[PDB]
Amino acid sequence: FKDLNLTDAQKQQIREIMKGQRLEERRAMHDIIASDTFDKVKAEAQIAKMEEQRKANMLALMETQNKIYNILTPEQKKQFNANFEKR
């Protein structure tokens, strides 16, 4: 949600930023959870594998937000930053 007063040109720019963005993991988790015994080495392997997808996801998320920040006016950026503190 946004109390930023986005102009229609800005909302268009944003929608375009989002579209430019563009289970196996959970399955492995499931097997760790459902096992008779807890296998720490196997869990560590799954955690490490998960770091790769987290990296990809956090990079897309940050880049997207940065792109949005930089189409805002100075007044809109203040509000964005204030909102960021509140989450």
Footprint of a copy of itself on 4-63 (CB under 8 A): 29-30, 32-38, 40, 43-44, 46-48, 50-51, 54-55, 58-59, 62-63
Closest approach, Cβ 15 to a copy of itself, in A, equals 19
Q: What is the C-alpha to C-alpha distance for residues 36 and 62, in angstroms, rounded to an integer?
A: 39
Per-residue binding letters, 57-76, with a copy of itself (x by CB under 8 A):
-xx--xx-xxx-xx------
Selection from Cl ion, a copy of itself, Zn ion, none that 38 binds (CB < 5 to 8 A by kind) is a copy of itself
